[PDB]
Structures are given as C-alpha cells and as structure tokens.
CSV table of N, CA and C in Angstrom, one decimal:
chain,number,residue,atom,x,y,z
A,705,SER,N,0.8,-1.2,0.0
A,705,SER,CA,0.0,0.0,0.0
A,705,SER,C,0.9,1.2,0.0
A,706,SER,N,2.0,1.2,0.7
A,706,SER,CA,2.9,2.4,0.8
A,706,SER,C,3.7,2.4,-0.5
A,707,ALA,N,3.7,1.4,-1.3
A,707,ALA,CA,4.5,1.5,-2.5
A,707,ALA,C,4.0,2.5,-3.5
A,708,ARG,N,2.6,2.6,-3.6
A,708,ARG,CA,2.0,3.7,-4.4
A,708,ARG,C,2.4,5.0,-3.9
A,709,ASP,N,2.4,5.2,-2.6
A,709,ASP,CA,2.8,6.5,-2.1
A,709,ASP,C,4.3,6.8,-2.4
A,710,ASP,N,5.1,5.8,-2.2
A,710,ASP,CA,6.5,6.0,-2.6
A,710,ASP,C,6.7,6.4,-4.1
A,711,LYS,N,6.0,5.7,-4.9
A,711,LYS,CA,6.1,6.1,-6.4
A,711,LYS,C,5.6,7.6,-6.5
A,712,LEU,N,4.5,7.9,-5.9
A,712,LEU,CA,3.9,9.3,-6.1
A,712,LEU,C,4.9,10.3,-5.5
A,713,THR,N,5.6,10.0,-4.4
A,713,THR,CA,6.5,11.0,-3.9
A,713,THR,C,7.7,11.1,-4.8
A,714,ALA,N,8.1,10.0,-5.4
A,714,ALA,CA,9.3,10.0,-6.4
A,714,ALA,C,8.8,10.9,-7.6
A,715,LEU,N,7.5,10.8,-8.0
A,715,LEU,CA,7.0,11.6,-9.1
A,715,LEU,C,7.1,13.1,-8.7
A,716,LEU,N,6.7,13.4,-7.5
A,716,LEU,CA,6.8,14.8,-7.1
A,716,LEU,C,8.2,15.3,-7.1
A,717,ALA,N,9.1,14.5,-6.6
A,717,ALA,CA,10.5,14.9,-6.5
A,717,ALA,C,11.1,15.1,-8.0
A,718,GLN,N,10.7,14.1,-8.9
A,718,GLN,CA,11.1,14.3,-10.3
A,718,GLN,C,10.5,15.6,-10.9
A,719,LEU,N,9.3,15.9,-10.6
A,719,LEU,CA,8.7,17.1,-11.1
A,719,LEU,C,9.4,18.3,-10.6
A,720,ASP,N,9.7,18.4,-9.4
A,720,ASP,CA,10.4,19.5,-8.8
A,720,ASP,C,11.8,19.7,-9.5
A,721,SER,N,12.6,18.5,-9.6
A,721,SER,CA,13.9,18.6,-10.3
A,721,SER,C,13.7,19.1,-11.7
A,722,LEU,N,12.6,18.6,-12.5
A,722,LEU,CA,12.4,19.1,-13.8
A,722,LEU,C,12.1,20.5,-13.9
A,723,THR,N,11.3,21.0,-12.9
A,723,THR,CA,11.0,22.4,-12.8
A,723,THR,C,12.2,23.3,-12.7
A,724,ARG,N,13.2,22.9,-11.8
A,724,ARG,CA,14.4,23.6,-11.5
A,724,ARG,C,15.2,23.6,-12.9
A,725,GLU,N,15.4,22.5,-13.5
A,725,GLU,CA,16.1,22.4,-14.7
A,725,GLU,C,15.5,23.3,-15.8
A,726,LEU,N,14.2,23.3,-15.9
A,726,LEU,CA,13.5,24.1,-16.9
A,726,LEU,C,13.8,25.6,-16.6
A,727,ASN,N,13.7,26.0,-15.3
A,727,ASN,CA,14.0,27.4,-15.0
A,727,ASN,C,15.4,27.8,-15.4
A,728,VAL,N,16.4,27.0,-15.0
A,728,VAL,CA,17.7,27.4,-15.4
A,728,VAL,C,17.9,27.4,-16.9
A,729,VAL,N,17.2,26.5,-17.7
A,729,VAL,CA,17.3,26.6,-19.1
A,729,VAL,C,16.7,27.9,-19.6
A,730,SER,N,15.6,28.3,-19.0
A,730,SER,CA,14.9,29.5,-19.5
A,730,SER,C,15.8,30.7,-19.2
A,731,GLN,N,16.6,30.7,-18.0
A,731,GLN,CA,17.5,31.8,-17.7
A,731,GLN,C,18.6,31.8,-18.7
A,732,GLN,N,19.2,30.7,-19.1
A,732,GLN,CA,20.2,30.8,-20.1
A,732,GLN,C,19.6,31.2,-21.4
A,733,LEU,N,18.3,30.9,-21.7
A,733,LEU,CA,17.7,31.3,-23.0
A,733,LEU,C,17.6,32.8,-22.9
A,734,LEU,N,17.1,33.5,-21.9
A,734,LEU,CA,17.0,34.9,-21.9
A,734,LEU,C,18.3,35.5,-22.0
A,735,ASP,N,19.3,35.0,-21.3
A,735,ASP,CA,20.7,35.5,-21.5
A,735,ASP,C,21.2,35.5,-22.9
A,736,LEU,N,21.0,34.4,-23.7
A,736,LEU,CA,21.4,34.3,-25.0
A,736,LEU,C,20.6,35.3,-25.9
A,737,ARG,N,19.3,35.4,-25.7
A,737,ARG,CA,18.5,36.3,-26.4
A,737,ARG,C,19.0,37.8,-26.3
A,738,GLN,N,19.2,38.1,-25.0
A,738,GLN,CA,19.7,39.5,-24.7
A,738,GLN,C,21.0,39.7,-25.3
A,739,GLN,N,22.0,38.8,-25.2
A,739,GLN,CA,23.2,38.9,-25.9
A,739,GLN,C,23.2,39.1,-27.3
A,740,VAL,N,22.3,38.3,-28.0
A,740,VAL,CA,22.2,38.4,-29.4
A,740,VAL,C,21.6,39.8,-29.8
A,741,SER,N,20.6,40.2,-29.0
A,741,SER,CA,20.0,41.6,-29.3
A,741,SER,C,21.2,42.7,-29.2
A,742,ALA,N,22.0,42.6,-28.2
A,742,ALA,CA,23.1,43.5,-28.0
A,742,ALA,C,24.0,43.5,-29.1
A,743,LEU,N,24.4,42.3,-29.6
A,743,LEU,CA,25.3,42.1,-30.7
A,743,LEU,C,24.7,42.7,-32.0
A,744,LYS,N,23.4,42.5,-32.2
A,744,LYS,CA,22.8,42.9,-33.4
A,744,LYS,C,22.5,44.4,-33.3
A,745,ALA,N,22.5,45.0,-32.1
A,745,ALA,CA,22.2,46.4,-31.9
A,745,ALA,C,23.3,47.4,-32.5
A,746,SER,N,24.5,46.9,-32.4
A,746,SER,CA,25.6,47.8,-32.9
A,746,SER,C,25.7,47.8,-34.5
A,747,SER,N,25.3,46.7,-35.1
A,747,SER,CA,25.4,46.6,-36.6
A,747,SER,C,24.8,47.7,-37.4
A,748,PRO,N,23.5,48.1,-37.1
A,748,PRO,CA,23.0,49.3,-37.9
A,748,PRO,C,23.2,50.6,-37.1
B,408,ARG,N,-0.2,44.1,-4.4
B,408,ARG,CA,1.2,44.6,-4.2
B,408,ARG,C,2.0,44.2,-5.4
B,409,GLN,N,3.2,44.7,-5.4
B,409,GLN,CA,4.1,44.4,-6.6
B,409,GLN,C,5.4,43.8,-6.1
B,410,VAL,N,6.0,42.8,-6.8
B,410,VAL,CA,7.2,42.2,-6.5
B,410,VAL,C,8.0,42.1,-7.7
B,411,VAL,N,9.3,41.7,-7.5
B,411,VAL,CA,10.3,41.6,-8.6
B,411,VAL,C,9.9,40.4,-9.5
B,412,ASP,N,9.8,40.6,-10.7
B,412,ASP,CA,9.5,39.5,-11.7
B,412,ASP,C,10.9,38.7,-11.8
B,413,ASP,N,10.9,37.5,-11.2
B,413,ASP,CA,12.1,36.8,-11.1
B,413,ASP,C,12.5,36.2,-12.4
B,414,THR,N,11.7,36.2,-13.5
B,414,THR,CA,12.1,35.8,-14.7
B,414,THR,C,12.5,36.9,-15.6
B,415,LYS,N,11.6,37.9,-15.9
B,415,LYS,CA,11.8,38.9,-16.8
B,415,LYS,C,12.9,40.0,-16.4
B,416,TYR,N,13.3,40.0,-15.2
B,416,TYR,CA,14.3,41.0,-14.8
B,416,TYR,C,15.6,40.5,-15.3
B,417,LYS,N,16.5,41.5,-15.6
B,417,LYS,CA,17.8,41.2,-16.3
B,417,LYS,C,18.8,40.6,-15.3
B,418,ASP,N,18.9,41.1,-14.1
B,418,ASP,CA,19.9,40.8,-13.1
B,418,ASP,C,19.3,40.3,-11.8
B,419,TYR,N,18.2,39.5,-12.0
B,419,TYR,CA,17.6,39.0,-10.7
B,419,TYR,C,18.5,38.1,-9.9
B,420,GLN,N,18.6,38.2,-8.6
B,420,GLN,CA,19.5,37.4,-7.8
B,420,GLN,C,18.7,37.0,-6.5
B,421,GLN,N,18.3,35.8,-6.4
B,421,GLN,CA,17.6,35.3,-5.3
B,421,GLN,C,18.5,35.4,-4.0
B,422,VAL,N,18.3,36.4,-3.2
B,422,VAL,CA,19.1,36.6,-2.0
B,422,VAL,C,18.3,36.1,-0.8
B,423,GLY,N,19.0,35.3,0.0
B,423,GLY,CA,18.4,34.8,1.2
B,423,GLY,C,18.5,35.8,2.3
B,424,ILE,N,17.8,35.5,3.4
B,424,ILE,CA,17.9,36.3,4.6
B,424,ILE,C,19.3,36.5,5.1
B,425,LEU,N,20.1,35.4,5.0
B,425,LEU,CA,21.4,35.5,5.6
B,425,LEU,C,22.4,36.4,4.8
B,426,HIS,N,21.8,37.1,3.7
B,426,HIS,CA,22.8,37.9,2.9
B,426,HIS,C,22.2,39.3,2.6
B,427,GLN,N,21.1,39.6,3.2
B,427,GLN,CA,20.5,41.0,3.0
B,427,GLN,C,21.1,42.0,3.9
B,428,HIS,N,22.0,42.8,3.4
B,428,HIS,CA,22.5,43.9,4.2
B,428,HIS,C,21.9,45.2,3.9
B,429,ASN,N,20.9,45.6,4.7
B,429,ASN,CA,20.3,46.9,4.5
B,429,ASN,C,20.5,47.4,5.9
B,430,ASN,N,20.6,48.6,6.1
B,430,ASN,CA,20.7,49.2,7.4
B,430,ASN,C,21.8,48.4,8.1
B,431,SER,N,22.9,48.3,7.4
B,431,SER,CA,24.0,47.6,7.9
B,431,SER,C,24.6,48.3,9.0
B,432,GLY,N,25.6,47.8,9.7
B,432,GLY,CA,26.4,48.5,10.6
B,432,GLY,C,25.6,49.1,11.8
B,433,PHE,N,24.2,49.0,11.7
B,433,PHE,CA,23.4,49.7,12.7
B,433,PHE,C,22.4,48.8,13.3
B,434,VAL,N,22.4,47.5,12.9
B,434,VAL,CA,21.4,46.5,13.4
B,434,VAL,C,22.1,45.2,13.6
B,435,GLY,N,21.7,44.4,14.6
B,435,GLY,CA,22.3,43.2,14.8
B,435,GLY,C,22.0,42.2,13.7
B,436,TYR,N,22.8,41.1,13.6
B,436,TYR,CA,22.7,40.2,12.5
B,436,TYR,C,21.8,39.1,12.9
B,437,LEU,N,20.6,39.0,12.2
B,437,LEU,CA,19.7,38.0,12.3
B,437,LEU,C,19.0,37.8,13.7
B,438,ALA,N,19.2,38.8,14.5
B,438,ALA,CA,18.6,38.7,15.8
B,438,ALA,C,18.7,40.2,16.5
B,439,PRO,N,17.8,40.5,17.4
B,439,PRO,CA,18.0,41.8,18.0
B,439,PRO,C,19.1,41.8,19.1
B,440,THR,N,20.1,42.4,18.7
B,440,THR,CA,21.3,42.5,19.6
B,440,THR,C,21.9,43.9,19.4
B,441,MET,N,23.2,44.1,19.9
B,441,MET,CA,23.8,45.3,19.6
B,441,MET,C,24.0,45.5,18.1
B,442,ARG,N,24.4,46.7,17.7
B,442,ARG,CA,24.7,46.9,16.3
B,442,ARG,C,25.9,46.2,15.9
B,443,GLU,N,25.9,45.6,14.6
B,443,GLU,CA,26.9,44.8,14.2
B,443,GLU,C,27.3,45.3,12.7
B,444,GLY,N,28.5,45.0,12.4
B,444,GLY,CA,28.9,45.3,11.0
B,444,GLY,C,29.3,46.8,10.8
B,445,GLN,N,29.6,47.0,9.5
B,445,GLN,CA,29.9,48.4,9.0
B,445,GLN,C,28.8,48.9,8.2
B,446,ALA,N,28.9,50.2,8.0
B,446,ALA,CA,28.0,51.0,7.1
B,446,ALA,C,28.4,50.6,5.7
B,447,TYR,N,27.2,50.5,4.9
B,447,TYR,CA,27.5,50.1,3.5
B,447,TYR,C,26.2,50.4,2.7
B,448,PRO,N,26.4,50.4,1.3
B,448,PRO,CA,25.3,50.6,0.6
B,448,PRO,C,24.5,49.3,0.7
B,449,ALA,N,23.2,49.4,0.7
B,449,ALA,CA,22.4,48.3,0.9
B,449,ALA,C,22.2,47.5,-0.4
B,450,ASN,N,21.7,46.3,-0.1
B,450,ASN,CA,21.5,45.4,-1.2
B,450,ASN,C,20.2,44.8,-1.3
B,451,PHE,N,19.2,45.1,-0.6
B,451,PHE,CA,18.1,44.4,-0.7
B,451,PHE,C,16.8,44.7,-1.2
B,452,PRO,N,16.1,45.5,-0.5
B,452,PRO,CA,14.8,45.6,-1.1
B,452,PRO,C,14.9,46.2,-2.5
B,453,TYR,N,14.3,45.7,-3.5
B,453,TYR,CA,14.6,46.0,-4.8
B,453,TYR,C,13.8,47.2,-5.2
B,454,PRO,N,14.4,48.2,-5.8
B,454,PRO,CA,13.5,49.3,-6.0
B,454,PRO,C,12.4,48.9,-6.9
B,455,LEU,N,11.2,49.4,-6.6
B,455,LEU,CA,10.1,49.1,-7.4
B,455,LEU,C,9.5,50.3,-8.0
B,456,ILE,N,10.1,51.5,-7.7
B,456,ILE,CA,9.7,52.8,-8.1
B,456,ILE,C,11.0,53.6,-8.6
B,457,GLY,N,10.8,54.8,-9.0
B,457,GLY,CA,11.9,55.6,-9.4
B,457,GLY,C,12.3,55.4,-10.9
C-alpha cells in the first residue's frame, strides 16, 4: 500500500527537479537572447 | 502589491535572509542585539519605483 505513495513521492521529486532544470534553461535562454540583441544592436 | 519578476528581470538574484545587508552596521545580525557590521550601501529591497 505504501509502494504507491513511494512512487507518487518520487514523481513529485522528479517534477520539482524538472522544474528547476526548466527554470535554469529559461534563464540561459533569456541571457542568450539579450546577448544576441546587444550584438545585433551595434550593426546598424 | 508588486514584487520583482524573477524571470523577466535582467539581473535578478535570489538573495536569502542570511545575505541581505540593509541598514547595515546599525542593526544586529539575524537577531535583536547590539549593532553589528559596518556601514554600506544596501542590497536588498529592490527598488520598485523611481
């Protein structure tokens, strides 16, 4: 009976880790977009 | 109320309690005690105006 709860808790932990990784990826994404914008800003 | 957009801000830095120095040098560290530390420009509450 506790096996299902263990699996559910593992699911929640995996979701939290996934959310953290997604957030850091989005941060890198914003950094790259801003850097590209700055680089293209000087060209014209 | 208004808070800092942790995503859209350019230089957002999640600062914990153990590293907010505002009113430094004139308030105890993490507890009401004698004044501790030196005076310094602060680093915490993020301006939401101005």
